[PDB]
RNA sequence: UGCGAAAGCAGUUGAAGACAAGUGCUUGUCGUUCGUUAUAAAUGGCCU
């Protein structure tokens, strides 16, 4: 129902990467979310794109390599071939291609510094080093019959344990190569497994209106966050200060201090976009850092637009109003209202 | 998924065209509308629409200049005495061609036309030509941008259809050959790079009531080139 | 002239394709046809105002 | 303004300009624009020039 | 003129008036393209 | 209390030479063909063709060099870009001053002012095809005579040198 | 800023320093044809005076039409006076009334003075 | 570039008694049919509802005329002696009429056979019988008994109220809109008596003095009532109880009066007043009741009426004459497979993003003479000037345009006596009128200067100049007279 | 051309040089000058 198959903000929240299909081929592009740069030069549409030369080929998971950490701004793309590509946006070319020996599609990827992790349809974990460009080890854990998601816990500066998800969620240690804890997940496959803070990671599943907040150390559901309609995309602010969920029906909901009756909490601020005429525009991604919330919606067919708003002052239910062309009388700059050429002198009529 | 599900057409789809590079499709009809769709194959939403009051749409096509690839434009025509051109979003830059420069007699409707690339050999510059169908065997050739009348070509009997062919000569050189056919079946072949002079004549064996003529296997309106070496 | 009046021809064999179109394929009165420059998409319009889109797997 | 077609010696016209045409030119790689200078000889006290830039496509004032 | 100032016209037809960070580089490279 | 200041513009400037015809226009259209530069008597206006509005005005009064030079001298030509070297223009006036200005921005208070060497010659026209520059100039029955020099900018001396070609 | 050009009025915006309009306020061969050779000797009507009421909705014009040469009626100038009106949004003045030969025949209207705001709410004028 | 100016038709300064927008609308009551009736038509009324057929009382019969057909469609002849009114009820279903015998009969309109209610109002004649506008049930009756009984359709045996106090014949009853309680009656005493039905009644609330016998009283608006009596009609205001206006343009005694408001005319409201001098004239209530139009008829006019506001079709002006003549004036008011092949023309782009229109509006076709001026056919433009059935004003232009263009001699070079005669023949006629006198003076001089020699050898032209010389001389005498009058006036002032 | 009203009241249209044509002479011309306030006529008519 949306032309944008997969989307992802950068860590800073300035640049959005989205993948869409042109005829039978997918194309990947990166565009500047902010209206104007720090230098004051207006941002412009980026026509440069990366085209996948094969129709069969598809992008399954996209991940930003942090802009500050690495000299070259890069985005890592997992592909259904079973190989991972490193994409540097400036050169508009894939710099290096990480290939696993097997051919199964990558279901999730996640990154910390040099450590790069991926999981296949064959339920095998893998490791990769960005600098050395090598496959370090690959192992299969028992009692992991599917792995729809992967997230590496933010512990120190090294990866000591990983969060992986199927209909149920699991925590695994790299060194012992065995599960540590098991959490009761959702009935449907898990869609989002982002880690809000220490000992608190949230979970959501396809075709579900609820998010479970799980404690890593203990394992009890701290809270169940509720959406008005299904959940598609997730973004958290700071450290559990606020959470933004992109609902499937096209609305953005904001949870305020969700980590503070108590068990099941509902979204406090709901955001929607409606054009002047009356048509509603769905939202397909969002980002919320401290007090600025970024809303991205599609105009034309795949032209993405952006808006920045301060959610603190916004009332509970707020609908942005946007000018979209509709029965717009076309006014050419070289004619007046009656079609006469502007240079022409008006004639004398008694 | 059908392309028109996103926004239906209220009249027949009189012409279709795929943009040379971008993934866009243009439709027109006697509804007097120009609908452009973004064909993905799964959603096919509507990029834009443009209503041309009192200009029934009989044929449409995208045009990308062979030198300045940034140039994009849409030519549309009908059973009317004027042709529209839309350069490529608050407003639309639409230009109306309604001057034939002394040949208004031969051309009383633009409803049939095609667009091709002409290389002015003495200068080696390449521009667009809009080709038209006259009254009695007359083919009018206009400059695409300025609208100037460049040359005219004539055949015997009622002109029914015509098609454009390119013949490379050397690195950076190519000649435009205009193929026209009569209702009975004579085929002419003008060389538009030498003032519209016939170069060959033949007959389509067993041709009677010819209706449309087309060429393929190389460059043409449906498979345009993007640089001179691709002709 | 008549509904479903469309055929595809292989070249240079000049042998018309037999599997497609079929009796059940929707074409109506085919009144406009367009091939995509790449990807082998085929868009066929009809008098009803519908542009039905097909894909050629070979391209 | 008269455009003489020299192939067949025909002509096309752009009449009723605001003044007499002191100058004409074709300004563009493909003759996109015609640049004109007008005089408005009515005002005999002063020389009242007006510069026009016309779009060759439809002969309409792109910039006056 | 009806506000305080006065306008005057010169034979040169001149109406005078008498009156009382890696992200920042990335933004630049993106704009250049 | 009261003060005097110029506000509006004035008549467009022209190549007021009887001999030259078809060259009376000195305005130019940018290389990208998105804006038209028209020199007036007291300023230079840059109009955007797409919007038909005056995007920029370069007034002679504001800048110091222009005020001294023009405020009698007139622009005999405008050349897009800069000869010595993307929004630069070079203005040649009849006496011989060559000034390198910029539109689409804020005018720089020290343009790369130069001065061609002419001996009792009034510069009439300048023109180029590809890095080659020729200048036509008038010297003195009431009929003026013309001379054609070849103009080149030498980087070492940063001066415009003129070599005689025709008379 | 309104300029009484020969047979026309040119409306110019000096805040923006551009022309906004150019309207022909007389009859005569103005733009119907291009005068050439002898026709060039013809003199179009000349707008001698142009003034506005204080309220600013009414435009008064005074015009002199010059007869052609070498006819019997080649020495009887025609003095015309016209009243126009427009709304603020509109850009073209519309002629509302026309007086032919005010004050008598061949007697000039040297001066026009729009009335002050007190009398008829600025909807009047004096001619001398 | 600019589109060519359209040649401006000449307009000489406005002369007195110009056509006014009020007159232009009322002159469209063109089609006139005169019908003859046995006796004087006394009263005329219009059905308030569609199709608004109007009833006319004459002799012993009432006739209903169709609005579209303008012919009798129903006839009520049951009345034994003369009939005196045909007012409809507000709904338009019923029709009430009076008799000399005094009985009041209520018939179902459009069913003359059926009689619904018969009332013996009084032994004296019953001249006025009107239904109440606000309330349907109550019916009013006026008699020469000088009592205006207020009847009720449900109870006919006794009157609901019996207003009295008039010392002369009562022939006029009016009900004031928006004040249903109030009732207004006028007698030949010269007093208009106003009564309140809510109170006990039988004694007027107050009397307005009209000073002449009152022939009809009409309530123009909720606060104004206009009464026509004697040689004038005076409009009264009840709140102040004094006359705002009076008009005495009429000569004979006004007889009837009718009012209509909110119809498609330039004038919002119209007051038509019969004269008995053969006149029925229109007055404008928004303009202090000033005249705007009038018609003259063969004999005295005894009744007037105009179609109601919601006519919904051709309007009618009806007048009644004592001779029995009735005058009516009227203001008249492929294959499916093909269609599917072209179904888009109806669309107006309501669902589209951008609407772009460039078609130039169609201008009126330009006449032949304008075509010749525009193409610089000077001589032909002169010929087209003098053609049979050419309106005088248009001809005067093409002479003026050519003079303004400076092409007078150019238009007269290639001419002989055969083709010069039309110009002189017009000039022979143009010289009379004040507007073209100056222009003809100009052209006539040129042809003499340019065809002196030709004139000598052609005898026909010589006569044209003698006849011309006669009439120009006659014009001098008229102008000289006008000067003497003008001097004569200055002496008086 | 000056003044004035629009009407008018006064006043001008000189000299040199050069070229062309006809036959040193005659006439006509000036993208030549000095001085005084100081017929036309290359078949040649305006878009969609
Ligand atoms: Mg069938």
From Swiss-Prot, chain A:
It is found in: Nucleus, Nucleolus. Keywords: Nucleus, Repeat, Ribonucleoprotein, Ribosome biogenesis, rRNA processing, Transcription, WD repeat. WD repeats lie at residues 13-53, 54-97, 185-224, 226-260. GO terms for biological process: maturation of SSU-rRNA; maturation of SSU-rRNA from tricistronic rRNA transcript (SSU-rRNA, 5.8S rRNA, LSU-rRNA); positive regulation of transcription by RNA polymerase I. The keyword Repeat applies. GO terms for cellular component: nucleolus; nucleoplasm; rDNA heterochromatin; small-subunit processome; t-UTP complex. The keyword Secreted does not apply. Involved in nucleolar processing of pre-18S ribosomal RNA. Required for optimal pre-ribosomal RNA transcription by RNA polymerase I together with a subset of U3 proteins required for transcription (t-UTPs). Belongs to the UTP5 family. Present with 33100 molecules/cell in log phase SD medium. Interacts with snoRNA U3. Interacts with MPP10. Component of the ribosomal small subunit (SSU) processome composed of at least 40 protein subunits and snoRNA U3. In the absence of snoRNA3, forms a complex with other t-UTPs. This complex can associate with pre-18S ribosomal RNAs. This is U3 small nucleolar RNA-associated protein 5.
Swiss-Prot record, chain C:
It is found in: Nucleus, Nucleolus. WD repeats lie at residues 25-58. Interacts with snoRNA U3. Interacts with MPP10, UTP21 and UTP25. Component of the ribosomal small subunit (SSU) processome composed of at least 40 protein subunits and snoRNA U3. Involved in nucleolar processing of pre-18S ribosomal RNA and ribosome assembly. Belongs to the WD repeat UTP18 family. Present with 9570 molecules/cell in log phase SD medium. This is U3 small nucleolar RNA-associated protein 18. It comes from Saccharomyces cerevisiae (strain ATCC 204508 / S288c). The gene is UTP18.
UniProtKB/Swiss-Prot annotation, chain D:
Signal peptide: none annotated. It is found in: Nucleus, Nucleolus. Interacts with snoRNA U3. Interacts with MPP10. Component of the ribosomal small subunit (SSU) processome composed of at least 40 protein subunits and snoRNA U3. In the absence of snoRNA3, forms a complex with other t-UTPs. This complex can associate with pre-18S ribosomal RNAs. Present with 6560 molecules/cell in log phase SD medium. Involved in nucleolar processing of pre-18S ribosomal RNA. Required for optimal pre-ribosomal RNA transcription by RNA polymerase I together with a subset of U3 proteins required for transcription (t-UTPs). This is NET1-associated nuclear protein 1. It comes from Saccharomyces cerevisiae (strain ATCC 204508 / S288c) (Baker's yeast). The gene is NAN1. The chain holds residues 321 to 384 of 896 of the full protein.
Curated annotation (Swiss-Prot), chain H:
Pfam families: UTP15_C, WD40. Involved in nucleolar processing of pre-18S ribosomal RNA. Required for optimal pre-ribosomal RNA transcription by RNA polymerase I together with a subset of U3 proteins required for transcription (t-UTPs). GO terms for cellular component: 90S preribosome; nucleolus; nucleoplasm; rDNA heterochromatin; small-subunit processome; t-UTP complex. The keyword ATP-binding does not apply. Keywords: Nucleus, Repeat, Ribonucleoprotein, Ribosome biogenesis, rRNA processing, Transcription, WD repeat. The lineage of its organism: Eukaryota, Fungi, Dikarya, Ascomycota, Saccharomycotina. GO terms for biological process: maturation of SSU-rRNA; maturation of SSU-rRNA from tricistronic rRNA transcript (SSU-rRNA, 5.8S rRNA, LSU-rRNA); positive regulation of transcription by RNA polymerase I; rRNA processing. It is found in: Nucleus, Nucleolus. This is U3 small nucleolar RNA-associated protein 15. WD repeats lie at residues 36-77, 78-117, 123-161, 165-205, 209-246, 249-293. SUPFAM superfamilies: WD40 repeat-like. One of its GO terms (molecular function) is U3 snoRNA binding. It comes from Saccharomyces cerevisiae (strain ATCC 204508 / S288c) (Baker's yeast). InterPro entries: U3_snoRNA-assocProt_15_C (IPR018983), WD40/YVTN_repeat-like_dom_sf (IPR015943), WD40_repeat_CS (IPR019775), WD40_repeat_dom_sf (IPR036322), WD40_rpt (IPR001680). Present with 358 molecules/cell in log phase SD medium.
């Amino acid at each position: 129902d949306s032309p944008v198959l997969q989307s992802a903000y950068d860590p800073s929240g300035q640049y959005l990467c989205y993948v869409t299909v042109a005829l039978d081929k997918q194309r990947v592009g990166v565009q500047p979310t902010q209206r104007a740069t720090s230098s004051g030069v207006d941002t412009v549409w980026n026509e440069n794109f990366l085209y996948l030369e094969d129709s069969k080929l598809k992008v399954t998971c996209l991940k930003w390599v942090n802009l500050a950490s690495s000299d070259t701004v890069a985005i890592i793309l997992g592909m259904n071939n079973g190989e991972i590509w490193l994409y540097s946006v400036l050169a508009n070319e894939v710099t290096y291609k990480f290939t696993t020996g097997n051919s199964y599609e990558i279901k999730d990827i996640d990154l910390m510094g040099n450590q790069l992790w991926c999981i296949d349809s064959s339920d095998a974990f893998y490791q990769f080093d960005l600098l050395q460009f090598k496959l370090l080890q690959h192992f299969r854990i028992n009692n992991c019959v599917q792995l729809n998601k992967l997230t590496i816990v933010p512990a120190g500066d090294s990866v000591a344990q990983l969060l992986v998800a199927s209909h149920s969620i699991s925590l695994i240690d790299i060194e012992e190569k065995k599960v540590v804890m098991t959490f009761p997940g959702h009935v449907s496959p898990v869609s989002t497994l982002q880690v809000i803070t220490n000992e608190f990671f949230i979970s959501g599943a396809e075709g579900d209106r609820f998010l479970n907040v799980y404690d890593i150390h203990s394992g009890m559901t701290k809270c169940v966050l509720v959406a008005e309609s299904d959940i598609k995309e997730l973004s958290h602010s700071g450290q559990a200060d606020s959470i933004a969920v992109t609902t499937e029906d096209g609305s953005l909901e904001i949870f305020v201090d969700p980590l503070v009756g108590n068990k099941s909490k509902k979204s406090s601020k709901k955001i929607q976009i409606v054009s002047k005429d009356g048509r509603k525009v769905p939202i397909y991604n969002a980002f919320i850092n401290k007090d600025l919330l970024n809303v991205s919606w599609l105009q034309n067919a795949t032209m993405p637009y952006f808006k920045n708003l301060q959610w603190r002052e916004i009332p509970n239910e707020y609908t942005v109003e946007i000018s979209l062309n509709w029965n717009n009388k076309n006014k050419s700059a070289d004619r007046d209202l009656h079609g006469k050429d502007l240079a022409s002198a008006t004639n004398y009529v008694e | 998924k059908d392309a028109n599900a996103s926004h239906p057409s209220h009249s027949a789809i009189q012409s279709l065209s795929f943009h040379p590079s971008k993934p866009l499709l243009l439709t027109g009809g006697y509804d007097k509308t120009l609908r452009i769709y973004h064909i993905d194959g799964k959603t096919n939403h509507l990029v834009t629409s443009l209503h041309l009051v009192g200009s029934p749409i009989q044929t449409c096509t995208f045009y990308t200049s062979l030198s300045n690839q940034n140039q994009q434009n849409i030519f549309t025509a009908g059973r009317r005495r004027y042709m529209h051109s839309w350069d490529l979003s608050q407003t639309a830059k639409i230009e109306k061609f309604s001057r034939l420069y002394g040949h208004e007699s031969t051309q009383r409707s633009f409803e049939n036309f095609k667009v091709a690339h002409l290389q002015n050999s003495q200068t080696n510059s390449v521009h667009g030509i809009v080709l038209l169908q006259g009254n009695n065997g007359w083919i009018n050739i206009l400059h695409s941008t300025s609208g100037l009348w460049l040359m005219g070509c004539k055949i015997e009997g009622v002109i029914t259809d015509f098609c454009i062919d390119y013949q490379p000569i050397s690195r950076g050189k190519f000649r435009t050959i205009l193929i026209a056919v009569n209702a009975y079946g004579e085929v002419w072949e003008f060389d538009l790079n030498k003032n519209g002079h016939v170069i060959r004549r033949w007959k389509d064996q067993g041709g009677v009531g010819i209706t449309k003529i087309q060429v393929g296997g190389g460059t043409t309106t449906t498979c345009p080139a993007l640089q001179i070496s691709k002709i | 002239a008549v509904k479903d009046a469309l055929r595809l021809v292989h070249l240079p064999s000049c042998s018309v394709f037999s599997n497609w179109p079929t009796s059940g394929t929707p074409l109506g009165k085919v009144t406009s046809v367009a091939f995509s420059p790449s990807g082998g998409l085929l868009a066929v319009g009809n008098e009803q105002g519908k542009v039905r889109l097909w894909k050629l797997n070979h391209y | 303004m008269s455009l003489w077609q020299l192939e067949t010696n025909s002509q096309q016209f752009l009449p009723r300009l605001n003044g007499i045409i002191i100058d004409c030119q074709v300004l563009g790689p493909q003759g996109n624009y015609y640049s004109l200078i007008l005089q408005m000889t009515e005002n005999n006290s002063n020389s009242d020039y007006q510069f026009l830039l016309l779009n060759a496509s439809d002969l309409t004032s792109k910039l006056s | 003129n009806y506000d305080t100032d006065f306008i005057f016209l010169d034979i040169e037809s001149t109406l005078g008036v008498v009156g009382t960070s890696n992200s920042d580089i990335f933004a630049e490279q993106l704009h250049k393209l | 209390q009261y003060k005097l200041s110029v506000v509006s513009g004035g008549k467009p400037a022209l190549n007021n030479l009887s001999s030259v015809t078809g060259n009376k226009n000195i305005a130019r259209l940018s290389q990208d063909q998105r804006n038209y530069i028209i020199p007036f008597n007291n300023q230079i206006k840059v109009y955007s063709v797409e919007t038909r509005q005056c995007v920029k005005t370069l007034k002679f009064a504001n800048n110091s060099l222009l005020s001294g030079i023009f405020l009698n001298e007139s622009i005999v030509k405008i050349l897009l870009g800069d000869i010595t070297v993307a929004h630069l223009i070079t203005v040649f006036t009849n006496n011989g001053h060559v000034i390198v200005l910029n539109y689409k921005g804020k005018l720089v208070e020290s343009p790369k002012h130069f001065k061609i060497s002419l001996a009792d010659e009034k510069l009439a026209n300048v023109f180029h095809s590809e890095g080659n520059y020729r200048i036509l100039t008038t010297f003195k029955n009431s009929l003026q005579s013309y001379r054609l020099y070849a103009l080149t900018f030498d980087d070492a001396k940063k001066q415009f040198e003129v070599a005689h070609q025709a008379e | 800023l309104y300029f009484p050009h020969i047979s026309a009025v040119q409306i110019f915006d000096f805040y923006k320093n551009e022309q906004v309009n150019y309207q022909y306020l007389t009859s005569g061969v103005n733009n119907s044809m291009g005068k050439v050779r002898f026709e060039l000797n013809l003199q179009d009507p000349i707008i001698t005076d142009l003034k506005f009421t204080k309220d600013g909705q009414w435009m008064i014009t005074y015009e002199i039409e010059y007869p052609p040469n070498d006819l019997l009626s080649s020495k009887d100038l025609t003095h015309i006076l016209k009243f126009w009106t427009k709304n603020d949004n509109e850009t073209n003045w519309n002629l509302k009334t026309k007086v032919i030969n005010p004050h008598g025949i061949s007697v000039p209207i040297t001066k026009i003075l729009p009335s002050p705001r007190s009398v008829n709410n600025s909807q009047g004028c004096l001619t001398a | 570039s600019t589109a060519r100016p359209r040649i401006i038709t000449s307009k000489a300064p406005l002369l007195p008694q110009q056509t006014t927008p009020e007159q232009r609308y009322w002159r469209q009551y063109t089609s006139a049919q005169l019908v003859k009736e046995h006796n004087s038509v006394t009263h005329i009324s219009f059905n308030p509802q569609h199709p608004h057929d109007f009833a006319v009382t004459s002799s012993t019969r009432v006739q209903i005329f169709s609005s579209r057909t303008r012919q009798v469609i129903k006839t009520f002849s049951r009345f034994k002696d003369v009939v005196y009114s045909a007012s409809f009820r507000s709904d338009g279903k019923l029709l009430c009429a009076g008799d000399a015998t005094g009985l009041v009969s209520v018939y179902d309109s459009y069913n003359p056979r059926t009689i619904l209610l018969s009332i013996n109002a009084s032994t004296h004649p019953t001249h006025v019988t009107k239904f109440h506008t606000q309330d349907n049930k109550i019916l009013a009756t006026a008699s020469d008994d000088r009592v205006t009984r207020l009847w009720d359709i449900s109870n006919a045996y006794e009157p609901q109220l019996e207003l009295t106090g008039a010392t002369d014949y009562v022939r006029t009853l009016s009900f004031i809109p928006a004040a249903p309680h109030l009732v207004a009656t006028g007698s030949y005493d010269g007093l208009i008596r106003l009564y309140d039905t809510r109170s006990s009644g039988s004694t007027p609330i107050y009397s307005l003095n009209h000073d002449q016998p009152v022939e009809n009283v009409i309530a123009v608006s909720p606060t104004q009532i206009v009464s026509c009596g004697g040689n004038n009609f005076k409009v009264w205001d009840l709140t102040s109880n004094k006359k705002l206006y009076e008009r005495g343009n009429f000569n004979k005694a006004v007889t009837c009066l009718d009012y209509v408001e909110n119809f498609d005319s330039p004038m919002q409201s119209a007051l038509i007043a019969s004269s008995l001098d053969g006149h029925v004239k229109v007055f404008d209530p928004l303009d202090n009741f000033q005249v705007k139009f009038g018609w003259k008829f063969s004999g005295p006019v005894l009744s007037c009426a105009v179609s109601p506001s919601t006519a919904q079709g051709n309007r009618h002006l009806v007048a009644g004459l004592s001779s029995g003549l009735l005058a009516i004036r009227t203001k008249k008011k492929k294959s499916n497979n093909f269609q599917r092949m072209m179904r888009g023309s109806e669309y107006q782009g309501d669902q589209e993003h951008i609407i772009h229109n460039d078609k130039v509006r169609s201008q009126r076709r330009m006449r032949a003479f304008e075509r010749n001026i525009n193409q610089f056919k000077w001589s032909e433009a002169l010929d087209n000037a003098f053609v049979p059935g050419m309106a005088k004003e248009l001809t005067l232009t093409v002479l003026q345009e050519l003079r303004k263009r400076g092409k007078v001699r150019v238009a007269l070079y290639g001419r002989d006596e055969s083709t010069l005669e039309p110009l002189l023949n017009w000039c022979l006629k143009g010289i009379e009128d004040v507007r073209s006198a100056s222009i003809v003076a100009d052209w006539v001089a040129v042809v003499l200067e340019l065809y002196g020699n030709t004139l000598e050898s052609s005898p026909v032209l010589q006569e044209l100049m003698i006849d011309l010389k006669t009439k120009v001389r006659h014009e001098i005498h008229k102008s000289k007279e006008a000067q003497r009058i003008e001097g004569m006036l200055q002496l008086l002032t």
